Amino acid sequence: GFRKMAFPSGKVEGCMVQVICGTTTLNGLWLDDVVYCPRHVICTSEDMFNPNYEDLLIRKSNHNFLVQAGNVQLRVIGHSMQNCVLKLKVDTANPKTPKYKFVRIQPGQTFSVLACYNGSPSGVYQCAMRPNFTIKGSFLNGACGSVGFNIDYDCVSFCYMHHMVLPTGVHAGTDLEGNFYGPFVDRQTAQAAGTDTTITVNVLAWLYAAVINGDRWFLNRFTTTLNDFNLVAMKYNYEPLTQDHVDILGPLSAQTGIAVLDMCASLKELLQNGMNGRTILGSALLEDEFTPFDVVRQC
Amino acid sequence: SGFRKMAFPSGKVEGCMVQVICGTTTLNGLWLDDVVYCPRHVICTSEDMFNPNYEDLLIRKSNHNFLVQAGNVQLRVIGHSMQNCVLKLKVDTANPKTPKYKFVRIQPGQTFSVLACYNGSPSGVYQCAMRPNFTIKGSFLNGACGSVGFNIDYDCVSFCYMHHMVLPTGVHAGTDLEGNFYGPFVDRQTAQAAGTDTTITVNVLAWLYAAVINGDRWFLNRFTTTLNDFNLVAMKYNYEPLTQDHVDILGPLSAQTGIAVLDMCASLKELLQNGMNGRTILGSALLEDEFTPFDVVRQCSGVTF
Ligand SMILES: Cn1cnc(Cn2c(=O)nc(Nc3cc4cn(C)nc4cc3Cl)n(Cc3cc(F)c(F)cc3F)c2=O)n1
Ligand SMILES: Cn1cnc(Cn2c(=O)nc(Nc3cc4cn(C)nc4cc3Cl)n(Cc3cc(F)c(F)cc3F)c2=O)n1
Numbered sequence: 001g002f003r004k005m006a007f008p009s010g011k012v013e014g015c016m017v018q019v020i021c022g023t024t025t026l027n028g029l030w031l032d033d034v035v036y037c038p039r040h041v042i043c044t045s046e047d048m049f050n051p052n053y054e055d056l057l058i059r060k061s062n063h064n065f066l067v068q069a070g071n072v073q074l075r076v077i078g079h080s081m082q083n084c085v086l087k088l089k090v091d092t093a094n095p096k097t098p099k100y101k102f103v104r105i106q107p108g109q110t111f112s113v114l115a116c117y118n119g120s121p122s123g124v125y126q127c128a129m130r131p132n133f134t135i136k137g138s139f140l141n142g143a144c145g146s147v148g149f150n151i152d153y154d155c156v157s158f159c160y161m162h163h164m165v166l167p168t169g170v171h172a173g174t175d176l177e178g179n180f181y182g183p184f185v186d187r188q189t190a191q192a193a194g195t196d197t198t199i200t201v202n203v204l205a206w207l208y209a210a211v212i213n214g215d216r217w218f219l220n221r222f223t224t225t226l227n228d229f230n231l232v233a234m235k236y237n238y239e240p241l242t243q244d245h246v247d248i249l250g251p252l253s254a255q256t257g258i259a260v261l262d263m264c265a266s267l268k269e270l271l272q273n274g275m276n277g278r279t280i281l282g283s284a285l286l287e288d289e290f291t292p293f294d295v296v297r298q299c
Numbered sequence: 300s301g302f303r304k305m306a307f308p309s310g311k312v313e314g315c316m317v318q319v320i321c322g323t324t325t326l327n328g329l330w331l332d333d334v335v336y337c338p339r340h341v342i343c344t345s346e347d348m349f350n351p352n353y354e355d356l357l358i359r360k361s362n363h364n365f366l367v368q369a370g371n372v373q374l375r376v377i378g379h380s381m382q383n384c385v386l387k388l389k390v391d392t393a394n395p396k397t398p399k400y401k402f403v404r405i406q407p408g409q410t411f412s413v414l415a416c417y418n419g420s421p422s423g424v425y426q427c428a429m430r431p432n433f434t435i436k437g438s439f440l441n442g443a444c445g446s447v448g449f450n451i452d453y454d455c456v457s458f459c460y461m462h463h464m465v466l467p468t469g470v471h472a473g474t475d476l477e478g479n480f481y482g483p484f485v486d487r488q489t490a491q492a493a494g495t496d497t498t499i500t501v502n503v504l505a506w507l508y509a510a511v512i513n514g515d516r517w518f519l520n521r522f523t524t525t526l527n528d529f530n531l532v533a534m535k536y537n538y539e540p541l542t543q544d545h546v547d548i549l550g551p552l553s554a555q556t557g558i559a560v561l562d563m564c565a566s567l568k569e570l571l572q573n574g575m576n577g578r579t580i581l582g583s584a585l586l587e588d589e590f591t592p593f594d595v596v597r598q599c600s601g602v603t604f
Binding site for chain 2: 001002003004005006007008009010011013014114115116117118120121122123124125127136137138139140142165169170171213214279282283284285298
């Protein structure tokens with residue numbers, strides 16, 4: 001089978017806490033004796049439009065931060081600011097702290113999101129960092145602080161912390177070091193995402209998965225060069241295809257016997273002529289939120 | 300903002316997954332208190348997979364022939380029993396991570412989260428629905444037999460599915476936690492056909508309501524219809540008949556959006572007869588039937604678990 005699959009969330013569920021600064025409530029990440037959370041928590045309703053975070057933080061004390069891990073209360077013994085992320089040292093180290101790493105992902109790579117509200121998880125889904133450095137997720141009010149992660153052999157690579165919803169409905173956030181993905185800033189102001197492109201290498205991997213799963217009607221009798229495909233791709237707002245992408249798609253080409261540049265020719269036709277109707281792997285669209293690695297792991 | 304296929308948090312179920320080995324046949328199991336529940340095909344060998352006599356196969360099995368591994372810890376089987384297609388192994392140690400739980404039998408159309416496990420170790424979680432043909436369209440590889448399906452209702456984990464086999468058509472089939480298969484399938488390596496599947500109508504309507512809640516409203520039309528006249532069109536497009544209970548389940552969503560069910564049915568009637576003409580709904584160019592009305596409430600205007 002082939003379905004959008006997320007990593008097991010257990011290791012991340014036990015690191016989620018609620019952080020309250022006055023009335024402003026959000027979610028936080030409890031790793032060892034430090035609680036990581038968005039620094040927008042130190043803002044009040046009148047500070048959200050244009051905040052001076054250095055001035056807002058200098059007036060705060062350790063006792064101004066309420067951190068709750070369920071019914072358990074944690075005592076803040078130190079506070080610091082790293083870019084757009086607030087770090088609260090606490091008296092107790094999280095016993096359920098997993099082996100972890102803080103990674104900064106690049107557009108096209110995927111991750112699992114644990115949507116949390118008031119420190120309590122609500123659901124898990126998979127989503128990708130769009131080339132415009134936004135993410136298409138499902139977030140409601142209070143989701144600020146929810147994290148995105150990948151798990152590789154019991155090690156959880158934290159890569160995203162949710163911050164804000166953009167006017168277009170897409171979402172924007174930071175890495176676990178506070179540096180935003182994209183040109184966005186933590187302020188309650190209208191910030192436009194930008195014209196998004198389609199992750200080409202991911203689309204091809206999904207087409208390879210369809211061949212592996214029976215759907216092979218899109219397969220044509222043509223081939224092309226990387227340059228002529230990139231010419232066609234640019235017209236339909238598709239990301240450029242590099243030799244790196246071709247080499248990563250090697251395993252998928254091997255299992256199917258379909259050369260990468262031939263799959264590019266099939267995608268070129270699907271773009272130039274259209275899809276008229278019909279479905280591929282359960283979709284009438286071309287999916288770009290499956291990395292080549294995700295496809296191999298599932299198929 | 301946004302709408303995605305969302306699964307329940309898997310933590311409570313991850314701590315109940317164990318590996319069960321009978322001689323060499325290896326599977327996954329569910330460790331709740333002092334009982335490990337697992338598919339009974341584990342007692343079959345390579346020559347027993349086609350037509351096994353499970354009563355006789357178990358009569359030749361002893362407690363020491365079942366190897367159950369809870370992570371690195373070894374569990375001692377102190378008793379074995381068979382309930383329908385489920386093997387139940389009493390163990391010496393009660394699972395300390397046993398959550399508050401229930402065993403429920405779901406009905407076709409209802410959804411649940413699946414924790415795909417291999418050799419006792421979870422690997423991924425996804426959401427899927429019990430198709431009207433009593434199969435499930437999932438992502439399972441070799442060794443997935445034993446993976447469980449669940450819903451979480453405020454700290455209570457309702458176990459509803461245990462994976463058994465992949466059917467020749469590529470779909471998947473399994474049982475409830477009392478051993479009774481979903482559908483007319485049997486635990487043996489024989490060619491078993493699923494049957495013609497229909498589209499869960501009430502789920503499609505709930506998904507359209509979810510789009511109204513999330514901004515997509517281009518499909519909302521100026522027409523209305525009756526339940527009977529829609530079911531005439533529904534049957535034509537291989538859709539399940541729409542009942543008054545389905546209408547009543549869509550009650551909450553209709554109020555929140557201000558759109559009557561029969562009006563949404565008329566828009567669906569048009570979407571079925573006319574098409575989607577390129578347009579997208581909630582990020583999809585097809586009509587989704589794997590979102591129950593409760594799933595929309597959970598995701599749209601819903602919170603913790
Ligand atoms: C609908 N939606 C989708 N994603 C989000 C994420 N998100 C959020 O969860 N909360 C936000 N504002 C807050 C208001 C508060 C009121 N109280 C009492 N406490 C509050 C805490 C927060 Cl964080 N925002 C808005 C927002 C948050 C930021 F971190 C930021 F830099 C700019 C912003 F405009 C938000 O987007 N909601
Ligand atoms: C590709 N795929 C998708 N879903 C599945 C589920 N599934 C499975 O995981 N394993 C199965 N056969 C086994 C072989 C074994 C070899 N050893 C050493 N131990 C084994 C244990 C099992 Cl279960 N099967 C086949 C199958 C399993 C049953 F429980 C059944 F009743 C009939 C069947 F044909 C399987 O479908 N694999």
